[PDB]
Amino acid sequence: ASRHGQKGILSRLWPAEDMPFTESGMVPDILFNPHGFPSRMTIGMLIESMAGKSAALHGLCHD
Amino acid sequence: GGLTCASAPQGTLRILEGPQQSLSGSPLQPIPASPPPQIPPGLRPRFCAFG
């Protein structure tokens, strides 16, 4: 789950070389479907994603 | 010692302590607004693109 009430079930442990790596070098760690959003309307997982990415890039903890 | 009766009293004065004046101030004292969040000073790109 997350902290925005959005359960997932672990379906497939995908090998790391098959993951979509980014332009910075990073693989992801959990892939989340864009079809869990529009019926559930958790905007708070979007702001938490931007917020935690920007807090891990600055040494900050965000309010 | 007979204690005869008397007429009907006209009015009844009620003595009571006065209202609490000068307790409340004429302006109000609110809790101040929690500030909007600031972009912190000293933010720079620490990630350089590799290679």
DSSP string, B16-49: -PPP-TTSS-SS--PPPPPPPPPPPS-----PPP
What is the C-alpha separation between A3 and B23, in angstroms, rounded?
47
Residues 6+ apart with CB under 8 A from A42: A4, A5, A6
The one-letter amino acid code at A24 reads S
**Closest by Cα among A7, A24, A26, A27 to A15:** A27
Alpha-carbon distance B32 to nearest alpha carbon in chain A (angstroms): 19
Identify each DSSP E strand in A1-63 by its residue range: none
Neighbouring C-beta atoms of residue A48, cutoff 10 Å: 16
Q: What is the CA radius of gyration of chain A?
A: 14
Taking the CA of residue A24 and the nearest CA in chain B, the distance in Å comes to: 7
Interchain CB distance below 8 Å, B47 and A24: yes
Nearest residue, CB atoms, B43 vs list A23, A24, A58: A58
Q: What is the resolution of this structure in A?
A: 3.1
| Maximum separation of any 2 CA atoms in chain B, in Å | 121
**B37–chain A Cβ distance below 8 A for any pair:** yes
Cα gap B34→B30, rounded to integer Å? 12
Tokens (6 digits) for A54: 């920007």
Experimental method: cryo-EM
Q: Which residues of B touch A58 (CB under 8 A)?
A: 40, 43, 46
Q: Which helix (H) or strand (E) holds A50?
A: helix A44-56
Task: Judge: A24–B43 Cβ closer than 8 Å, yes or no.
Answer: no
Q: Which residues contact A45 (CB under 8 A, 6 or more apart)?
A: A2, A4, A6, A37
Return the structure tokens found at A41.
């309307």
